[PDB]
Amino acid sequence: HLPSADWQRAALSLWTHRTFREVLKEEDVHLTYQDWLHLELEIQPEADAL
Amino acid sequence: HLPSADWQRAALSLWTHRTFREVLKEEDVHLTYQDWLHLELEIQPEADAL
């Protein structure tokens, strides 16, 4: 669904969307351990979302 | 090592100077362990002088 209400609502609405969950069942995208490691390595502590 | 050697020499001159040492003796200025802790906690992991 396109409607650009906000960011949080868009993210969660895409999250609950069916076809999106269907895509995640073929494991080229399941975010393996090492992948997550790399992605969290890229972030710095100076800037801070968490 | 650190930025301008002039500030370093100023700090050393003040540190070695006598009346500095005689002031250092009588005790509330003596950096309680808790105060050291408070200050080292105040600083961050982001801007790290060391």
Length, in residues, of chain A: 50
**DSSP label at residue B3:** S
Q: Is A49 on the interface with B (CB under 8 A)?
A: no
Q: Is B48 on the interface with A (CB under 8 A)?
A: no
Q: Which residues of B touch A50 (CB under 8 A)?
A: none
Residue A40 CA, distance from chain mean position: 13
Backbone conformation region of residue A31, classed left if phi is above 0, alpha if psi is from -120 to 50, else beta: left
Query: What is d(CA B45, CA B16) in angstroms, rounded to the nearest whole number?
Result: 31
* Resolved by: cryo-EM
Q: What are the tokens at A32?
A: 């393996």
Instruction: Please give the full DSSP string across A2-42, using - where no structure is assigned.
Output: ---S-HHHHHHHHHH-HHHHHHTTSTTSS--HHHHHHHHHH
